[PDB]
Amino acid sequence: NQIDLNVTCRYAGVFHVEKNGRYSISRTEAADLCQAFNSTLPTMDQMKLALSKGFETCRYGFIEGNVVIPRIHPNAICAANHTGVYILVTSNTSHYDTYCFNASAPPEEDCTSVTDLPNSFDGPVTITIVNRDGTRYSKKGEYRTHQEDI
Ligand SMILES: Cc1nc[nH]c1CN1CCc2ccccc2C1
What domain count does the chain have? Predict the structure, then answer.
């Protein structure tokens, strides 16, 4: 009974979270996940500031109201060579990654490891935070509040 959460550097408090390394987070689960990190889904303005500080990914993730990919460098296989905060317009499907925003993070780039899931609650799941440098933190708990997500 195990969940891996892959997390990125924070840029102006904004980071990317992927569950089990594949698109697998619903919009309701995304809200619960950010809450577990004492974070919220970012606004577009928050995401644009993160982009300006160096944030980019090659993965679709929820923000408040949209699914986006932040892009600095144009790449043919990431958001079809666009730069800026690329907004997903047309999709059949409902599961992506998420972005989260932590107001207590440093103002610019923070590439230190994430070491806790401070607001997870009591539960049976072994939840493992996995940093890009491979550093791991594990705890038993739960973050999902909606049954359709469990
Ligand atoms: C390349 C890729 N394919 C699916 N997801 C991804 C990006 N992931 C790859 C795995 C990973 C692990 C820890 C922190 C960040 C990431 C980013």
Answer: 1
